[PDB]
Symmetry: C3
């Protein structure tokens, strides 16, 4: 069994909605990024790559490479997962923590769990996503961006 | 074995002391929250709920529900744990990281470990709590609030 | 199997280079600290101590103790590891996440993995280090300091 950890942040910018955990969540502003800026999945991705000792998403899919511009993060999640399984690993379970003052993630978590579980080909019970606020404190507290953390256990 | 991760932040406000890890720590200002605002235990709670795939504390005990106003977080910790065990899980071990510029957590960690170990009905050796500063950097660095992180492994 | 988590931050100050993961990385400014201020290794250290239920680096090697002034963090990593093994633990694997806007950590990760793997006496495949930016957001985003997170699994 191997443990992995990921972390990611993206600044707000442009018009909404945002894409978090694969779900299109309506919001005033959107998120600035080379890909779709899905903070939730980038963190999950790194956590998986991390546990598999495959590095990180920024080594696998560079900002530099314009092929990744506008990239659907689920697409990136599946590839990393493809490569992870190839190295011989299987999913133990994953946990994700979105840190944002707004929008409300809560109602969207189930659909997120559906997308992720599909993408990893695991049962939803092996996928958990949760959310928290920094109580107005911080760049997140000030609504300047959204951060996310994730842990994974591969077998 | 399942892995979980939690994270929480609370802003300073009012008069002290604060309650971190169940311990009443003397401080100038206190912590703003719907419950007792015990950052340490909320993070631990989510980490456990997370590993058990039971969501998060904000789904289990809403800000909205006035029954939780002033709630003793150990009380919330025990319930989540009750439900977690009901799902068939047992404690592997937990690790908590308090991130605060002040007050000094260090002297209080043992008592915190005593409360948590009791609450989870595990041996203290399965419970670890530590502390760190952001070296004046950040909302925590500026003494605007206290954040905490936690990881848990259920069996 | 036990899980551990660590976290650390250090402010920029003085002239560079910085020392992250044991590697001397060239940078304009350096990092302020009592030891060499190697954020990466302090976080890794706490993660290991954490999983072993041995507390944290600030309890083991105090700021107060002037013997630790200028301390090479690898030296601290090895001791904590010494004590950790003495308690009967062996390395499962570790994952580290450096959070910095600059300098570029990426090219240095391999050497970091070499130092850490040596220090823990494990194969490099059991050691993973990755890096991320807060996209200009935060004290890290503003280039005020560098933070790092880490998870470890002991057996
Ligand atoms: Zn990202
Ligand atoms: Zn809280
Ligand atoms: Zn440090």
């Amino acid at each position: 069994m191997r443990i992995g950890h990921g972390f990611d942040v993206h600044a707000f910018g442009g018009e909404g909605p945002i894409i978090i955990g694969g779900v299109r969540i309506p919001y005033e502003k959107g998120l600035l990024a080379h890909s779709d800026g899905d903070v939730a999945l980038h963190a999950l991705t790194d956590a998986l790559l991390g546990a598999a000792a495959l590095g990180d998403i920024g080594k696998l899919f560079p900002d530099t490479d314009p092929a990744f511009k506008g990239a659907d993060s689920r697409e990136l999640l599946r590839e990393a997962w493809r490569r992870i399984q190839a190295k011989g690993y299987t999913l133990g379970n994953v946990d994700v923590t979105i840190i944002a003052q707004a929008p409300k993630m809560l109602p969207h978590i189930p659909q997120m769990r559906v997308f992720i579980a599909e993408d990893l080909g695991c049962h939803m019970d092996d996928v958990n996503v949760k959310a928290t606020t920094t109580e107005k404190l911080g760049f997140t507290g000030r609504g300047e961006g959204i951060a996310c953390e994730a842990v994974a256990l591969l077998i």
